PDB file of all heavy atoms in Angstrom:
ATOM      1  N   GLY Y 197       0.857  -1.184   0.000  1.00 26.72           N
ATOM      2  CA  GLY Y 197       0.000   0.000   0.000  1.00 26.72           C
ATOM      3  C   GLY Y 197       0.893   1.233   0.000  1.00 26.72           C
ATOM      4  O   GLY Y 197       2.049   1.162   0.430  1.00 26.72           O
ATOM      5  N   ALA Y 198       0.365   2.365  -0.478  1.00 21.70           N
ATOM      6  CA  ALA Y 198       1.177   3.580  -0.713  1.00 21.70           C
ATOM      7  C   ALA Y 198       0.429   4.919  -0.544  1.00 21.70           C
ATOM      8  O   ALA Y 198      -0.671   4.958   0.023  1.00 21.70           O
ATOM      9  CB  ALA Y 198       1.841   3.503  -2.088  1.00 21.70           C
ATOM     10  N   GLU Y 199       1.047   6.003  -1.030  1.00 21.74           N
ATOM     11  CA  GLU Y 199       0.462   7.353  -1.021  1.00 21.74           C
ATOM     12  C   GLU Y 199       0.264   7.946  -2.426  1.00 21.74           C
ATOM     13  O   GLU Y 199      -0.527   8.881  -2.599  1.00 21.74           O
ATOM     14  CB  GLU Y 199       1.293   8.299  -0.146  1.00 21.74           C
ATOM     15  CG  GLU Y 199       1.179   8.025   1.350  1.00 21.74           C
ATOM     16  CD  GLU Y 199       1.775   9.125   2.210  1.00 21.74           C
ATOM     17  OE1 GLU Y 199       1.319  10.286   2.112  1.00 21.74           O
ATOM     18  OE2 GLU Y 199       2.691   8.823   3.003  1.00 21.74           O
ATOM     19  N   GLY Y 200       0.980   7.405  -3.416  1.00 20.64           N
ATOM     20  CA  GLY Y 200       0.829   7.819  -4.818  1.00 20.64           C
ATOM     21  C   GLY Y 200       1.704   7.075  -5.814  1.00 20.64           C
ATOM     22  O   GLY Y 200       2.742   6.516  -5.449  1.00 20.64           O
ATOM     23  N   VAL Y 201       1.267   7.071  -7.074  1.00 21.32           N
ATOM     24  CA  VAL Y 201       2.031   6.514  -8.201  1.00 21.32           C
ATOM     25  C   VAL Y 201       2.494   7.666  -9.096  1.00 21.32           C
ATOM     26  O   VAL Y 201       1.701   8.543  -9.461  1.00 21.32           O
ATOM     27  CB  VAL Y 201       1.216   5.487  -9.030  1.00 21.32           C
ATOM     28  CG1 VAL Y 201       2.117   4.734 -10.000  1.00 21.32           C
ATOM     29  CG2 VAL Y 201       0.504   4.495  -8.125  1.00 21.32           C
ATOM     30  N   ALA Y 202       3.779   7.638  -9.447  1.00 19.12           N
ATOM     31  CA  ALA Y 202       4.463   8.749 -10.114  1.00 19.12           C
ATOM     32  C   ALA Y 202       4.329   8.770 -11.640  1.00 19.12           C
ATOM     33  O   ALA Y 202       3.896   7.790 -12.255  1.00 19.12           O
ATOM     34  CB  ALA Y 202       5.935   8.758  -9.718  1.00 19.12           C
ATOM     35  N   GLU Y 203       4.705   9.911 -12.224  1.00 17.37           N
ATOM     36  CA  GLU Y 203       4.877  10.080 -13.671  1.00 17.37           C
ATOM     37  C   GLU Y 203       6.082   9.266 -14.174  1.00 17.37           C
ATOM     38  O   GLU Y 203       6.116   8.866 -15.343  1.00 17.37           O
ATOM     39  CB  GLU Y 203       5.069  11.565 -14.005  1.00 17.37           C
ATOM     40  CG  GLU Y 203       4.689  11.977 -15.423  1.00 17.37           C
ATOM     41  CD  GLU Y 203       3.355  12.701 -15.514  1.00 17.37           C
ATOM     42  OE1 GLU Y 203       2.878  13.256 -14.500  1.00 17.37           O
ATOM     43  OE2 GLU Y 203       2.777  12.721 -16.619  1.00 17.37           O
ATOM     44  N   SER Y 204       7.063   9.041 -13.293  1.00 16.45           N
ATOM     45  CA  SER Y 204       8.217   8.173 -13.569  1.00 16.45           C
ATOM     46  C   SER Y 204       7.829   6.696 -13.613  1.00 16.45           C
ATOM     47  O   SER Y 204       8.409   5.921 -14.379  1.00 16.45           O
ATOM     48  CB  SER Y 204       9.326   8.397 -12.536  1.00 16.45           C
ATOM     49  OG  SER Y 204       8.913   7.991 -11.244  1.00 16.45           O
ATOM     50  N   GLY Y 205       6.853   6.322 -12.785  1.00 14.82           N
ATOM     51  CA  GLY Y 205       6.351   4.952 -12.718  1.00 14.82           C
ATOM     52  C   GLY Y 205       6.338   4.378 -11.314  1.00 14.82           C
ATOM     53  O   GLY Y 205       5.376   3.710 -10.923  1.00 14.82           O
ATOM     54  N   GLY Y 206       7.406   4.651 -10.560  1.00 17.84           N
ATOM     55  CA  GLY Y 206       7.587   4.135  -9.199  1.00 17.84           C
ATOM     56  C   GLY Y 206       6.621   4.679  -8.159  1.00 17.84           C
ATOM     57  O   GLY Y 206       5.719   5.461  -8.480  1.00 17.84           O
ATOM     58  N   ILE Y 207       6.829   4.279  -6.903  1.00 13.53           N
ATOM     59  CA  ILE Y 207       5.837   4.509  -5.842  1.00 13.53           C
ATOM     60  C   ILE Y 207       6.262   5.478  -4.729  1.00 13.53           C
ATOM     61  O   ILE Y 207       7.347   5.352  -4.152  1.00 13.53           O
ATOM     62  CB  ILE Y 207       5.225   3.161  -5.337  1.00 13.53           C
ATOM     63  CG1 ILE Y 207       3.806   2.977  -5.896  1.00 13.53           C
ATOM     64  CG2 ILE Y 207       5.183   3.045  -3.816  1.00 13.53           C
ATOM     65  CD1 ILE Y 207       3.742   2.520  -7.341  1.00 13.53           C
ATOM     66  N   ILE Y 208       5.379   6.437  -4.453  1.00 15.69           N
ATOM     67  CA  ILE Y 208       5.590   7.454  -3.421  1.00 15.69           C
ATOM     68  C   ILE Y 208       4.942   6.933  -2.144  1.00 15.69           C
ATOM     69  O   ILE Y 208       3.710   6.872  -2.040  1.00 15.69           O
ATOM     70  CB  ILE Y 208       4.993   8.839  -3.815  1.00 15.69           C
ATOM     71  CG1 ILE Y 208       5.081   9.123  -5.337  1.00 15.69           C
ATOM     72  CG2 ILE Y 208       5.587   9.957  -2.960  1.00 15.69           C
ATOM     73  CD1 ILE Y 208       6.459   9.062  -5.978  1.00 15.69           C
ATOM     74  N   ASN Y 209       5.781   6.556  -1.183  1.00 14.99           N
ATOM     75  CA  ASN Y 209       5.331   5.748  -0.058  1.00 14.99           C
ATOM     76  C   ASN Y 209       5.777   6.246   1.326  1.00 14.99           C
ATOM     77  O   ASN Y 209       5.777   7.452   1.573  1.00 14.99           O
ATOM     78  CB  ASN Y 209       5.719   4.285  -0.298  1.00 14.99           C
ATOM     79  CG  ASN Y 209       4.685   3.302   0.229  1.00 14.99           C
ATOM     80  OD1 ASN Y 209       4.013   3.549   1.235  1.00 14.99           O
ATOM     81  ND2 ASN Y 209       4.564   2.166  -0.445  1.00 14.99           N
ATOM     82  N   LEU Y 210       6.148   5.317   2.212  1.00 10.26           N
ATOM     83  CA  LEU Y 210       6.330   5.607   3.637  1.00 10.26           C
ATOM     84  C   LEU Y 210       7.695   5.219   4.226  1.00 10.26           C
ATOM     85  O   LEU Y 210       8.697   5.179   3.512  1.00 10.26           O
ATOM     86  CB  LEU Y 210       5.171   5.014   4.458  1.00 10.26           C
ATOM     87  CG  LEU Y 210       3.843   5.782   4.499  1.00 10.26           C
ATOM     88  CD1 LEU Y 210       2.679   4.823   4.687  1.00 10.26           C
ATOM     89  CD2 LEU Y 210       3.831   6.859   5.577  1.00 10.26           C
ATOM     90  N   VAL Y 211       7.698   4.926   5.529  1.00  7.49           N
ATOM     91  CA  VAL Y 211       8.890   4.833   6.398  1.00  7.49           C
ATOM     92  C   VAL Y 211      10.042   3.872   5.988  1.00  7.49           C
ATOM     93  O   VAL Y 211      11.114   3.900   6.602  1.00  7.49           O
ATOM     94  CB  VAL Y 211       8.441   4.630   7.881  1.00  7.49           C
ATOM     95  CG1 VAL Y 211       8.090   3.174   8.169  1.00  7.49           C
ATOM     96  CG2 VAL Y 211       9.471   5.159   8.873  1.00  7.49           C
ATOM     97  N   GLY Y 212       9.831   3.046   4.963  1.00  8.10           N
ATOM     98  CA  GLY Y 212      10.884   2.155   4.448  1.00  8.10           C
ATOM     99  C   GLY Y 212      10.411   1.206   3.368  1.00  8.10           C
ATOM    100  O   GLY Y 212       9.739   0.211   3.659  1.00  8.10           O
ATOM    101  N   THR Y 213      10.779   1.507   2.122  1.00  8.83           N
ATOM    102  CA  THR Y 213      10.169   0.871   0.962  1.00  8.83           C
ATOM    103  C   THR Y 213      11.201   0.553  -0.100  1.00  8.83           C
ATOM    104  O   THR Y 213      11.146  -0.514  -0.712  1.00  8.83           O
ATOM    105  CB  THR Y 213       9.059   1.751   0.340  1.00  8.83           C
ATOM    106  OG1 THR Y 213       9.550   3.085   0.140  1.00  8.83           O
ATOM    107  CG2 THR Y 213       7.826   1.786   1.241  1.00  8.83           C
ATOM    108  N   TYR Y 214      12.127   1.488  -0.315  1.00  8.54           N
ATOM    109  CA  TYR Y 214      13.156   1.325  -1.327  1.00  8.54           C
ATOM    110  C   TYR Y 214      14.015   0.099  -1.029  1.00  8.54           C
ATOM    111  O   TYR Y 214      14.305  -0.688  -1.933  1.00  8.54           O
ATOM    112  CB  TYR Y 214      14.016   2.588  -1.464  1.00  8.54           C
ATOM    113  CG  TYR Y 214      15.215   2.439  -2.392  1.00  8.54           C
ATOM    114  CD1 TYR Y 214      15.076   2.539  -3.783  1.00  8.54           C
ATOM    115  CD2 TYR Y 214      16.498   2.204  -1.874  1.00  8.54           C
ATOM    116  CE1 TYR Y 214      16.177   2.404  -4.628  1.00  8.54           C
ATOM    117  CE2 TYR Y 214      17.605   2.068  -2.709  1.00  8.54           C
ATOM    118  CZ  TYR Y 214      17.442   2.168  -4.083  1.00  8.54           C
ATOM    119  OH  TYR Y 214      18.537   2.035  -4.909  1.00  8.54           O
ATOM    120  N   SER Y 215      14.385  -0.055   0.244  1.00  6.51           N
ATOM    121  CA  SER Y 215      15.172  -1.195   0.720  1.00  6.51           C
ATOM    122  C   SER Y 215      14.458  -2.501   0.399  1.00  6.51           C
ATOM    123  O   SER Y 215      15.062  -3.453  -0.119  1.00  6.51           O
ATOM    124  CB  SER Y 215      15.420  -1.091   2.233  1.00  6.51           C
ATOM    125  OG  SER Y 215      16.084  -2.239   2.737  1.00  6.51           O
ATOM    126  N   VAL Y 216      13.162  -2.510   0.712  1.00  4.93           N
ATOM    127  CA  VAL Y 216      12.284  -3.661   0.496  1.00  4.93           C
ATOM    128  C   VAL Y 216      12.293  -4.038  -0.996  1.00  4.93           C
ATOM    129  O   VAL Y 216      12.449  -5.217  -1.360  1.00  4.93           O
ATOM    130  CB  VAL Y 216      10.837  -3.393   1.018  1.00  4.93           C
ATOM    131  CG1 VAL Y 216      10.002  -4.665   1.019  1.00  4.93           C
ATOM    132  CG2 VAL Y 216      10.856  -2.802   2.425  1.00  4.93           C
ATOM    133  N   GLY Y 217      12.141  -3.011  -1.832  1.00  7.10           N
ATOM    134  CA  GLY Y 217      12.127  -3.156  -3.284  1.00  7.10           C
ATOM    135  C   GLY Y 217      13.415  -3.797  -3.770  1.00  7.10           C
ATOM    136  O   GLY Y 217      13.401  -4.736  -4.580  1.00  7.10           O
ATOM    137  N   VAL Y 218      14.523  -3.275  -3.247  1.00  7.46           N
ATOM    138  CA  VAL Y 218      15.873  -3.741  -3.572  1.00  7.46           C
ATOM    139  C   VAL Y 218      15.998  -5.235  -3.246  1.00  7.46           C
ATOM    140  O   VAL Y 218      16.490  -6.036  -4.059  1.00  7.46           O
ATOM    141  CB  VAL Y 218      16.932  -2.875  -2.826  1.00  7.46           C
ATOM    142  CG1 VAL Y 218      18.268  -3.587  -2.671  1.00  7.46           C
ATOM    143  CG2 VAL Y 218      17.123  -1.538  -3.529  1.00  7.46           C
ATOM    144  N   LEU Y 219      15.526  -5.577  -2.050  1.00  5.59           N
ATOM    145  CA  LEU Y 219      15.603  -6.945  -1.582  1.00  5.59           C
ATOM    146  C   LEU Y 219      14.787  -7.878  -2.483  1.00  5.59           C
ATOM    147  O   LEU Y 219      15.250  -8.957  -2.847  1.00  5.59           O
ATOM    148  CB  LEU Y 219      15.276  -7.074  -0.090  1.00  5.59           C
ATOM    149  CG  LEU Y 219      16.485  -6.775   0.810  1.00  5.59           C
ATOM    150  CD1 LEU Y 219      16.070  -6.032   2.067  1.00  5.59           C
ATOM    151  CD2 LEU Y 219      17.270  -8.034   1.154  1.00  5.59           C
ATOM    152  N   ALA Y 220      13.603  -7.408  -2.876  1.00  6.20           N
ATOM    153  CA  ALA Y 220      12.728  -8.145  -3.788  1.00  6.20           C
ATOM    154  C   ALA Y 220      13.426  -8.408  -5.114  1.00  6.20           C
ATOM    155  O   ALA Y 220      13.396  -9.521  -5.635  1.00  6.20           O
ATOM    156  CB  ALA Y 220      11.418  -7.405  -4.007  1.00  6.20           C
ATOM    157  N   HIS Y 221      14.074  -7.361  -5.625  1.00  2.00           N
ATOM    158  CA  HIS Y 221      14.814  -7.448  -6.873  1.00  2.00           C
ATOM    159  C   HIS Y 221      15.916  -8.495  -6.782  1.00  2.00           C
ATOM    160  O   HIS Y 221      16.091  -9.312  -7.690  1.00  2.00           O
ATOM    161  CB  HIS Y 221      15.392  -6.102  -7.309  1.00  2.00           C
ATOM    162  CG  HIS Y 221      16.195  -6.183  -8.571  1.00  2.00           C
ATOM    163  ND1 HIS Y 221      15.616  -6.332  -9.813  1.00  2.00           N
ATOM    164  CD2 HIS Y 221      17.532  -6.162  -8.780  1.00  2.00           C
ATOM    165  CE1 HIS Y 221      16.561  -6.387 -10.734  1.00  2.00           C
ATOM    166  NE2 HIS Y 221      17.733  -6.285 -10.134  1.00  2.00           N
ATOM    167  N   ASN Y 222      16.631  -8.463  -5.659  1.00  2.00           N
ATOM    168  CA  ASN Y 222      17.706  -9.403  -5.384  1.00  2.00           C
ATOM    169  C   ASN Y 222      17.189 -10.837  -5.399  1.00  2.00           C
ATOM    170  O   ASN Y 222      17.792 -11.727  -6.013  1.00  2.00           O
ATOM    171  CB  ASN Y 222      18.374  -9.086  -4.041  1.00  2.00           C
ATOM    172  CG  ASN Y 222      19.415  -7.986  -4.146  1.00  2.00           C
ATOM    173  OD1 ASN Y 222      20.606  -8.231  -3.957  1.00  2.00           O
ATOM    174  ND2 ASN Y 222      18.974  -6.768  -4.452  1.00  2.00           N
TER     175      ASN Y 222
END
């Protein structure tokens, strides 16, 4: 869940998400 979807494509979110994304990618 999030706060918005960007013109770039990615997600405008909360207290820790990028790390999670990275881990998923890995």
Side-chain angles (χ1 to χ4, degrees):
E199 289 192 59
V201 191
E203 204 103 21
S204 66
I207 256 78
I208 326 304
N209 216 327
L210 280 151
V211 81
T213 50
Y214 173 81
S215 175
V216 190
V218 158
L219 277 143
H221 178 74
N222 278 246

